Design an enzyme around this catalytic site. Structure first.
Site, PDB file in Angstrom:
ATOM      1  N   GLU A  32       0.799  -1.228   0.000  1.00 25.44           N
ATOM      2  CA  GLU A  32       0.000   0.000   0.000  1.00 25.44           C
ATOM      3  C   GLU A  32       0.826   1.269   0.000  1.00 25.44           C
ATOM      4  OE1 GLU A  32      -3.123   0.194  -0.533  1.00 25.44           O
ATOM      5  OE2 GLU A  32      -3.666  -1.923  -0.272  1.00 25.44           O
ATOM      6  N   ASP A  50      -6.820   7.489  -0.355  1.00 20.43           N
ATOM      7  CA  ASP A  50      -6.448   6.582   0.730  1.00 20.43           C
ATOM      8  C   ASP A  50      -5.293   7.167   1.544  1.00 20.43           C
ATOM      9  OD1 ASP A  50      -8.250   4.676  -0.291  1.00 20.43           O
ATOM     10  OD2 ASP A  50      -6.933   4.622  -2.004  1.00 20.43           O
TER      11      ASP A  50
END
Length: 122
Positions: A32, A50
């Protein structure tokens, strides 16, 4: 700033994360955010972003400080997810896992195999 597999594993363990979950968490984090705590990912096709080391979505899980509608299911500012202290990101990530499972991460697809032991971290 930036974690390494083991530092992250150590911190998450410290924070109450079962060692059983750490290869997965760190795999996710590597995918991520490359372990970066302060990353806001590129804007998604739906206009969301995000946040943080686990790239938690500002439409579902945290409240954009800019006022943007969110479900804010973690009950925190998205900014809270960008801190050098991963505590908030850890709790929120754990809640997300609890609700939607690892599968809540797109990168889970890479992280669902026979990951190396985290034992070398301890």
């Amino acid at each position: 700033k930036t974690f390494t597999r083991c530092s992250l594993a150590r911190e998450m363990y410290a924070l109450g994360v079962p060692k059983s979950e750490l290869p997965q968490w760190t795999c996710i984090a590597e995918h991520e955010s490359s372990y970066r705590t302060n990353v806001v990912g590129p804007t998604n096709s739906n206009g969301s972003n995000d946040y943080g080391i686990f790239q938690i979505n500002n439409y579902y899980w945290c409240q954009p400080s800019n006022g943007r509608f969110s479900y804010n299911e973690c009950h925190l500012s998205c900014d809270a997810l960008l801190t050098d202290n991963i505590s908030n990101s850890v709790t929120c990530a754990r809640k997300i896992k609890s609700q939607q499972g690892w599968t809540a991460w797109s990168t889970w697809k890479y992280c669902s195999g026979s990951l190396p032991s985290i034992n070398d971290c301890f």
